[PDB]
Design a protein around this ligand. Structure first.
Ligand SMILES: Nc1ncnc2c1ncn2[C@@H]1O[C@H](COP(=O)(O)OP(=O)(O)OC[C@H]2O[C@@H](O)[C@H](OC(=O)c3ccccc3)[C@@H]2O)[C@@H](O)[C@H]1O
Ligand SMILES: [Zn+2]
Length: 287
């Protein structure tokens, strides 16, 4: 583990004008205390999940939601952005941004913790959307998140928010199954893939080699799980994950670095080796 983290730091110091793409999953938010929508519990939500959902993921299915918004509403209450403090790993992303070495973070999480830790909106790509905004599912009119958040406080929750223009259901801009993923996801990955193949030279007579770091995901859900094998072979991949998964398990590459480590301790150790503790510590205390 510490040797692998050493190599990541050494690569970054050998390529100081190169940037890093992160691809992340639910594992980077577990230390924040965010419930897993699949896990049991005591709330109204777990009662509804057990009684009303034909399968766990239907809480995110747009056809189910139209027939019965209550399960999703009760889940949004427990995932409410603002409840949870971003993790050390989330702040590592902000630190890389401050150091100008964050190319992008592709996140499968809806919790908005990357943005809340201070990562810029244009550096975040959401594979399932997020709670950042609300929209009508029928016509697309933008709503202030506050209107949806007001309903979440009612006891009980009834009279779900409806569009004042067309009367259809309003919900956070999470991409539900049955909804199209925005064009910006695929076009951003197209552009960033092209950048991963680019020859970028600055200091000396050598290119600035980038890096892709995959963290806290089991790489079992498609289409997101297709991205790691789409990283060019000539670009070094890191997997920081409690288990080896996805393309790192089947078609491991000679240059792959696999680190079985918790995301928060990986961040501490990486910052350790990079010599960025002082900058990192200021960010953690401010937020
Ligand atoms: N501290 C730690 N440090 C390092 N690694 C850690 C760690 N703690 C755990 N791990 C490793 O973290 C991995 C977690 O894997 P897991 O499959 O749970 O999450 P995922 O992101 O890959 O899921 C992809 C999608 O699956 C769907 O259910 C869910 O869809 C939605 O939310 C969704 C929402 C709205 C609309 C539509 C969909 C999700 O977005 C495991 O390998 C653990 O070993
Ligand atoms: Zn509408």
């Amino acid at each position: 583990t510490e040797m692998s983290v050493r190599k990541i730091a050494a690569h970054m110091k050998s390529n100081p004008n190169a940037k890093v793409i992160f691809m992340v999953g639910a594992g980077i938010s577990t230390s924040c205390g965010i419930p897993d929508f699949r896990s049991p519990g005591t709330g109204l939500y777990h009662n509804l999940a057990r009684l009303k959902l034909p399968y766990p993921e239907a809480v995110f299915d747009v056809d189910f939601f139209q027939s019965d918004p209550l399960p999703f509403y009760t889940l949004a209450k427990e995932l409410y952005p603002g409840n949870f403090r971003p993790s050390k790993f989330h702040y590592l992303l902000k630190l890389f941004q401050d150091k100008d070495v964050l190319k992008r973070v592709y996140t499968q999480n809806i919790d908005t913790l990357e943005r809340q830790a201070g990562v810029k909106d244009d550096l975040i790509i959401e594979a399932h959307g997020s709670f950042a905004h609300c929209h009508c599912i029928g016509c697309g009119k933008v709503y202030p998140p506050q209107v949806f958040k007001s309903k979440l406080a009612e006891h009980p929750i009834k009279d779900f928010v409806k569009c004042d223009v067309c009367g259809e259901l309003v919900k956070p801009a999470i991409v539900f199954f049955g909804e199209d993923l925005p064009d910006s996801f695929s076009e951003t990955w197209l552009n960033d893939s092209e950048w991963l193949r680019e020859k970028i030279t600055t200091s000396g007579k050598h290119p600035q080699q980038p890096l892709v770091i995959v963290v806290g995901t089991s790489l079992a859900v498609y289409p997101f799980a297709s991205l790691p094998e789409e990283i060019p072979r000539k670009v070094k991949r890191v997997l920081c994950n409690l288990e080896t998964v996805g393309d790192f398990k089947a078609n491991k590459r000679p240059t792959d670095l696999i680190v079985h480590q918790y995301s928060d301790e990986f961040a501490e150790q990486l910052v350790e080796e990079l010599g960025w503790q002082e900058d990192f510590e200021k960010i953690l205390t401010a937020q």
